[PDB]
Scaffold this active site. Structure first.
Site, PDB file in Angstrom:
ATOM      1  CG  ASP A 343      -6.021   5.924   2.776  1.00 14.62           C
ATOM      2  OD1 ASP A 343      -4.961   6.295   2.239  1.00 14.62           O
ATOM      3  OD2 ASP A 343      -6.080   4.992   3.600  1.00 14.62           O
ATOM      4  CG  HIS A 463      -1.684   3.743  -0.439  1.00 16.28           C
ATOM      5  ND1 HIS A 463      -2.430   4.055   0.675  1.00 16.28           N
ATOM      6  CD2 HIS A 463      -2.512   3.072  -1.276  1.00 16.28           C
ATOM      7  CE1 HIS A 463      -3.661   3.590   0.521  1.00 16.28           C
ATOM      8  NE2 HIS A 463      -3.734   2.991  -0.655  1.00 16.28           N
ATOM      9  CG  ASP A 465       0.923   7.746   1.693  1.00 13.93           C
ATOM     10  OD1 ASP A 465       0.913   6.507   1.684  1.00 13.93           O
ATOM     11  OD2 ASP A 465       0.021   8.419   2.241  1.00 13.93           O
ATOM     12  CB  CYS A 639      -3.758   8.544  13.248  1.00 18.96           C
ATOM     13  SG  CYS A 639      -3.851   7.909  14.913  1.00 18.96           S
TER      14      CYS A 639
END
Ligand SMILES: [Ca+2]
Ligand SMILES: [Ca+2]
Ligand SMILES: [Ca+2]
Ligand SMILES: [Ca+2]
Ligand SMILES: [Ca+2]
Ligand SMILES: [Ca+2]
Ligand SMILES: [Ca+2]
Ligand SMILES: [Ca+2]
Ligand SMILES: [Ca+2]
Ligand SMILES: [Ca+2]
Lengths: 659, 659
Positions: A343, A463, A465, A639
């Site tokens: 991020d 986001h 992603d 993570c």
């Protein structure tokens, strides 16, 4: 380049002649009143033409020829070689009146020829050529020319916290390797004639875009003198005679951005001293231009170098499985003991013909979560750049999970050899979230990745992603767009239910979810969840269409991965089970978040389904469990990973971006 | 343009289809679990293809054909004509399981086809063509396309002080003639299906660059509704069925400038209502782009229309002689009862394919001399624009005697069809005066006149028009650069002295100069004056060289007019006798300031000399006396003139400016 030099009435003129120019010389004004004709003599290395109303005639060194004095009869004076101490370079004009052949007066021009050229590597081969005629302009493309400059944003030595370009000083000679060379080449006699000096300079505006250093080798060691840059707009050059070169090193301080195209200029002028209190006259000026290299992003198809991973020290399964994955490849694994690595940072690169190196873009800090920049990656040939909103407040869409880039594509016959940057946004009339203007302006200003906004604002975190990724197709030059799909998940669950598996349990082995006993039946029976996910599928499809349009993709290029979301109070989506689309892509090897889907015959039906889509294409799937250490999944991942990749083979300066 | 539309499991989908797109349709997700095959029916005006893994096959309206259900087997759905009330446009899919040929379920797609196109005159012929495929881009050149917009900077009616574009209102229909037309063309049934609306919109950023009006014809008269512009970013369109057009009128509010390229965009979207609290989904979007026309200057070679003159009411000789001059031509003379008309205003123009008109640029006010703008020329089809320094202080170099433009030229093979703007400046390292950044940025932003800075700062007043002007060569397409020359004046005076005229007197008939008794002898004997003028000649020659370089001129193109200056404490020049170079150019007829030079045989030797240079070329000289009314000349001129000229025949949009 023609330059005006007048003989002076009754007296003699002394001038410097710069090679590559020529003089037009008025002999009429210096002639006494009443004079009729003139004749001339000149020295060996001065070429003289008499030009009568446009017609030019070459004249001997000592002839007796005479011409009528006329305002329209002038001289053109040329020299092809620099003066030395053995030179007497001159033109002498004699005037005659009506009667008699003896001169009644004479005027003369004494010349000192010098060569002055400010040279850069404008042909982009890494070596500095002599006086490239295109050095004063900058053109894109394979046939394009003009010199390139890197922002010198890395840090040579650790003893100081700041990137190399933040000051006016150079410490290590290694710094010079990041810099573009500029050579001032001169040729001439032992000294310049009285009243002349040579001066390098830049505009006030460029003074914060560049710095220029000269290397001296005094007694006690090499030293680096800052001659142009912040608060130094000019430098008087020490002139040396004979054939001489001064080597300078140029660094960029600033990336292209809103209001800065990336082009900067450096000048040298020969200045003539007129008198006290009067400005010096630029006699001759030579100019070179540099373009500062843009920041460029690397798509998932580029070779992986290093896998950066962030997780808590005790998430053992994650670490073990990521290590296994990376061992299948030649990549280095770097671990830091938790989403910040994905991020807060985007690994890009910069390249010039002489040099290149990776550069981190650091996400803007809000003051709430991130109050501090992450500078700890700044190092030798690892650079840093960041943008800070002055007014606009940071949202989740400013995080770099919201910043990705496509593989190279061609769209309606236009090639994007570096791919296109993709950032999530909301609809124009929505009043929703959008990445900050300062960062969007930055990416747009780099120009070579031509950014596209997708729609991410239907997601709680927001986001790109979360819903999409790219993977190469092994053994080919092609790639696939991977899209999260709720319809695929419902189709699959409905089949397994029909097959008698409706009581199959999810999140098996996550102790914190056990009391919920979530089964396929329970999911399929939840009516409101069905409607939410139909809506999310519309949001996905809207993106699918934009991507197909702006990347020039067909349905052949797309694979749908089952996904499922839950809706929050804002009508935004968060993952129901981990999003498999956001995966570590190392060529054919894919680390895919373990979904914890319904077990059928002791295998996750989501895992088997994903393997059935990908494996036939030569992609090898490893499922990576990042949630077991937490005993439950609430929609957040703990993570992060970021893969640093090799730069494109294609040189950015060979692109031809739209005007 | 491909768009994704999924059949919904078990239920039916209703969608709007916009002509010019096509749908890819997933039939697999809606199929019940366990289903094996599908078949389809469709209506007359819906074209349906079954696409199996890339291979497309057209299907009949009612066939019995069956295909295997596969995620990679989809439909492509196309319509070529808008729906009417007589339409039932549909595709129905039937599903079958392993055994039996009777459908076990069906899913369907009901379609309403409409046409939506936002149209502008992008081919620049003045009429609005249907859906120009290039309408969303803007390209320069003879082959270029995209629509053009005028800054609507004139004033239709006098009752308000401000230019038309300063508000959100339109009063007179004449205003619409200044505006570019944009038509939203639609075709469809009586109403849009439930949950859809059509919306025009612009970005916040463009909201201060444009305004958009719609004309209504209610009972009591025509009215003008402002639908987009300042503080209005979107407008919901009222939809009418059948084939319909909505005509809009677009005005530009702002010229290109630093930070504004001149390009603006307008969008229309079909929006779908999802539910309360959720943003509407843009279903389809169409975009048009406009470029706002730049401000363009007219060189002395363009046909004169009006001569504006300012002088005191009692300067009779000036008025009489200017009137005489203008009577030789077809120009109008306009007199105002004193340099402001030359110094405070520059007449430019703007042009779009539909319309064009002159526009005044008003010089920045300092607060000392000019505390107020001159708006009194603002009128119907006579526009106004100005720039005000926010920080930087105004100097004499901001006055428009310092702003001129060359005739069209070609330089090193690059054509400048509109000529190049010329403004006086100082040397880069000099710390001297320079025109304000805000004005320089403005001229540069217009782009089509590619401005060049000369050196004017050696002059006390500091204006390029003090030392240079252009004149056409009658009976040709060519022109001359005229340069002030001190060497020419000294040459001429020295000849007349040799001829026995040394006691010839200047300023004859100016009573306030008589006691000075300035003769040729007195001038030639003044040694310091000689040195000052040699230096000023160097300043002139420096400009000569820049002009030759940047305008692509040779010595053949230049004529030198005798001039003489005196130096002030700052080492700057002011005219010793009126500067003849700054002259009224009406084609072959030239009003030239009367020099009051030495009388030889009862004629001014300066007048005779200037006639001898110009008259052979077909130029007719009239000397205009603006100083006799003042009885003396101290170096200042008390009158001013400005000629308003016809625009270039060459259309600015046919140029191809450098990137
Ligand atoms: Ca080179
Ligand atoms: Ca440094
Ligand atoms: Ca460095
Ligand atoms: Ca380095
Ligand atoms: Ca990223
Ligand atoms: Ca048209
Ligand atoms: Ca108005
Ligand atoms: Ca108007
Ligand atoms: Ca008008
Ligand atoms: Ca002017």
């Amino acid at each position: 380049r023609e330059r005006t030099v007048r003989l002076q009435y009754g007296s003699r003129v002394e001038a410097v002649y710069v090679l590559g120019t020529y003089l037009w010389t008025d002999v009429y004004s210096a002639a006494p009143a009443g004079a009729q004709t003139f004749s001339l003599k000149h020295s060996e290395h001065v070429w003289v033409e008499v030009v009568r109303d446009g017609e030019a005639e070459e004249v001997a060194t000592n002839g007796k020829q005479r011409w009528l004095l006329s305002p329209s009869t002038t001289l053109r004076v040329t020299m092809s070689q620099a003066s030395t101490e053995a030179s007497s370079d001159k033109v002498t004009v004699n005037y005659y009146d009506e009667e008699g052949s003896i001169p009644i007066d004479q005027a003369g021009l004494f010349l000192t020829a010098i060569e002055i050229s400010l040279d850069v590597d404008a042909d982009r081969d890494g070596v500095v050529e002599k006086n490239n005629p295109k050095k004063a302009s900058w053109t894109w493309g394979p046939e394009g020319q003009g010199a390139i400059l890197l922002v010198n944003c890395d840090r040579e030595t650790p003893w100081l916290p700041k990137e190399d370009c933040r000051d006016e000083k150079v410490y290590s000679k290694e710094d010079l390797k990041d810099m573009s060379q500029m050579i001032l080449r001169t040729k001439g006699p032992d000294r310049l004639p009285a009243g002349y000096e040579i001066v390098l300079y830049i505009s006030m505006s460029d003074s914060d875009k560049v710095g220029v250093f000269y290397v001296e080798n005094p007694f006690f060691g090499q030293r680096y003198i800052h001659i142009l840059g912040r608060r130094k707009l000019y430098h008087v050059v020490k002139y040396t005679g004979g054939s001489a070169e001064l080597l300078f090193f140029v660094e960029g301080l600033c990336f292209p951005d809103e209001g800065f195209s990336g082009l900067v200029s450096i000048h040298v002028s020969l200045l003539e001293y007129m008198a006290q209190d009067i400005p010096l006259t630029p006699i001759f000026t030579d100019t070179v231009i540099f373009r500062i290299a843009p920041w460029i992003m690397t798509p998932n198809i580029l070779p992986p170098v290093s896998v950066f991973v962030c997780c808590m020290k005790d998430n053992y399964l994650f670490l073990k499985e990521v290590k296994n994955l990376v061992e299948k490849t030649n990549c280095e694994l770097k671990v830091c003991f938790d989403r910040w690595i994905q991020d807060e940072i985007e690994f890009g690169y910069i390249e010039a013909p002489h040099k290149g190196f990776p550069v981190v873009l650091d996400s803007p800090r809000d003051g709430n979560l991130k109050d501090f920049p992450v500078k700890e990656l700044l190092g030798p040939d690892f650079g840093y750049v960041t943008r800070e909103p002055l007014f606009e407040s940071v949202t989740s869409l400013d995080s770099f999970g919201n910043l990705e880039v496509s593989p190279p594509v061609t769209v309606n016959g236009k090639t994007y050899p570096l791919g296109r940057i993709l950032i999530g946004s909301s609809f124009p009339l929505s009043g929703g979230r959008r990445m900050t203007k300062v960062v969007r302006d930055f990416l747009k200003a780099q120009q070579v990745q031509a950014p596209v906004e997708l729609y991410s604002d239907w997601l709680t975190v927001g986001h790109v992603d979360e819903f999409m990724s790219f993977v190469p197709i092994p053994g080919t030059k092609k790639f696939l767009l991977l899209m999260a799909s709720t319809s695929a998940c419902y189709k699959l669950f409905r089949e397994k239910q029909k097959d008698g598996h409706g009581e199959a349990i999810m999140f098996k082995g996550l102790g914190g979810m056990s009391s919920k006993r979530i089964t396929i039946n329970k999911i399929l029976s939840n009516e409101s969840l069905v409607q939410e996910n139909l809506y999310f599928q519309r949001c996905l499809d809207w993106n699918r269409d934009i991507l197909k349009k702006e990347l020039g993709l067909t349905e052949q290029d797309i694979i749908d991965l089952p996904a499922l979301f839950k809706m929050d109070e804002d009508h935004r989506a968060r993952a129901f089970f981990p999003n498999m689309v956001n995966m570590i892509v190392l060529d054919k090897d894919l680390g895919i978040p373990k979904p914890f889907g319904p077990q059928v015959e002791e295998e996750c039906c989501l895992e088997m389904h994903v393997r059935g889509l990908l494996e036939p294409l030569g992609l090898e799937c490893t499922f990576i469990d990042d949630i077991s250490a937490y005993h439950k999944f609430l929609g957040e991942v703990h993570c992060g990973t970021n893969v640093r990749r090799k730069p494109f083979t294609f040189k950015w300066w060979h692109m031809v971006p739209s005007r």
